[PDB]
Design a protein around this ligand. Sequence first.
Ligand SMILES: O=c1[nH]c(-c2cccc(NS(=O)(=O)c3cccs3)c2)cs1
Length: 125
Amino acid sequence: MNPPPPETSNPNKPKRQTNQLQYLLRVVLKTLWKHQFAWPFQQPVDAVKLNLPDYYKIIKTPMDMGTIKKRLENNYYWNAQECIQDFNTMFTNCYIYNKPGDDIVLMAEALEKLFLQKINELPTE
Ligand SMILES: O=c1[nH]c(-c2cccc(NS(=O)(=O)c3cccs3)c2)cs1
């Protein structure tokens, strides 16, 4: 069973645009998206499709790059750090749901290193 995907809009929450958030969409996300290991992370885990009936029994704060992309596109975030926390939740979720050395974990580890490389330096505001 799949819960609804994480919100990508919320009228109670204030919106913002910053140079750093623009960069997170235009450079960081859009480059990671093209990586050969990006595909498992491009949309919410579909537990019915993937036959992972325990996925949402284990993972209570799901996150994926599709959701992050839509959040950036909709100016959902207040700042870069908020967006960065979503990437970090995505990676951590993968390590939590799986086991060290798993192929899916190797993919997340590779993406995380590339992500860290790209956010090491952000534009100034
Ligand atoms: O913890 C997470 N698993 C996934 C995911 C996405 C697509 C397919 C799978 N299962 S899978 O096809 O057996 C697989 C194993 C290694 C990479 S994908 C997991 C995303 S986040």
